[PDB]
Amino acid sequence: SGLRKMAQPSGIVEPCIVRVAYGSNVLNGLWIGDEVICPRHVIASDTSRVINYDNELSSVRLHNFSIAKNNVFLGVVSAKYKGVNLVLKVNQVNPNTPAHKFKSVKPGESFNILACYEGCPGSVYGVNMRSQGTIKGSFIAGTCGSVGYVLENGILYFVYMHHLELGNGSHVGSNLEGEMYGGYEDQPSMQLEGTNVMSSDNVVAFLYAALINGERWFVTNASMSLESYNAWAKTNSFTEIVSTDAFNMLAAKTGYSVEKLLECIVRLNKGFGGRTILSYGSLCDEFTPTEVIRQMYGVN
Ligand SMILES: *[C@@](O)(CO)[C@H](C[C@@H]1CCNC1=O)NC(=O)[C@H](CC(C)C)NC(=O)c1cc2c(OC)cccc2[nH]1
């Protein structure tokens, strides 16, 4: 038993991380095949002020890139923007390149961050994408270009590359196509996140996790229909439930219908009144149904 926010193991990704520096800027890149992908602001003269990315590319010089992995130095032979990333063709193929694909995550989906510090993998942790496209992580100077990934059916997907932190502390990055999640600009900007909408699917999963753990104080003699819940969600900054297929196994194994837990959400969102659930003091939307099934029952 127990519920922990976890990451899938990082070994397959670690050999792909390099240090990328240009001028006084230092961050991380992803070395796969004979390409290094990194945030394009590494070439900007002054990242503390609004950047004209046209001007920074016009004045770039390929020789000024410093790219390294331990005692391997990589020379850049071509540089392009691909969205908000640089794609740098280098003079050596990474012999440890794993088989991989690219995909974009969606709001409510979980993935893993390999947090990298000026080219050195430092830590690994799980995240969940918020409705506005942000994540809540722990990123500091030197961590841009840290990589998000997910393993799904024996396939490694690269899904995220880190760029910035909003004034409210939320973390912003791009897919590996260089499309910023949420559409935020790669600028030092007071751009606003927008209103956060909780993932109902994930809150339901969290309550199922508490039931699996043997905690059931919060369940009442009541149950809310799906249309009723969805009408409430729309006015209370929760997502509408579009399918209950993700909960069939959880309902079957716990004996509790999704509608019982929908009633719990509406009631608990008013406050836990000093109680906790899985030691939390408020509802948590960080765990997907898949995450809960996998770590609590060991299947899928
Ligand atoms: C990368 O390491 C840079 O290479 C860095 C990561 C952030 C540092 C603190 N937490 C992080 O996630 N990214 C930045 O420093 C970016 C660089 C931009 C995109 C060119 N800037 C910010 O994240 C940033 C600047 C400002 C700001 O200014 C003015 C005002 C409000 C928020 C804000 N975020």
Author numbering: 1 to 300
The study reports:
Coronaviral Mpro is a 3C-like cysteine protease that cleaves the viral polyproteins (pp1a and pp1ab) at evolutionarily conserved sites to release non-structural proteins which are essential for viral replication and transcription in host cells. Due to its indispensable role in viral replication, evolutionary conservation among coronavirus genera (alpha, beta, gamma, delta), and absence of mammalian homologs, Mpro stood out as a promising drug target for developing pan-coronaviral therapeutics. In this study, we present crystal structures of Mpro from the feline coronavirus strain FECV-UU23 in complex with four clinically relevant inhibitors: GC376, PF-00835231, nirmatrelvir, and ibuzatrelvir.
In each protomer of the UU23 Mpro crystal structure, PF-00835231 was stabilized by multiple hydrogen bonds and vdW interactions with the active site residues. Importantly, the leucine moiety (P2) of the inhibitor was tucked in the S2 subsite with the coordination of a water-mediated hydrogen bond with residue T47. Despite variations in loop conformation and sequence, the binding mode of PF-00835231 in the active pocket is highly conserved (RMSD < 0.2 Å). As a result, the warhead (P1’) and γ-lactam moiety (P1) of PF-00835231 were completely buried in beta and delta coronavirus complexes, whereas in UU23 Mpro, the wider active site resulted in the inhibitor being more solvent-exposed. In the enzyme inhibition assays, all four inhibitors demonstrated nanomolar potency, with PF-00835231 being the most potent (IC50 = 3.9 ± 0.2 nM), followed by GC376 (IC50 = 12.4 ± 1.3 nM), ibuzatrelvir (IC50 = 41.6 ± 5.5 nM), and nirmatrelvir (IC50 = 55.7 ± 4.7 nM) against UU23 Mpro. Additionally, the polar S3 pocket (E165) together with the moderately hydrophobic yet flexible S4 region of UU23 Mpro accommodate the polar P3 indole moiety of PF-00835231 better as compared to the flexible P4 moieties of nirmatrelvir and ibuzatrelvir.
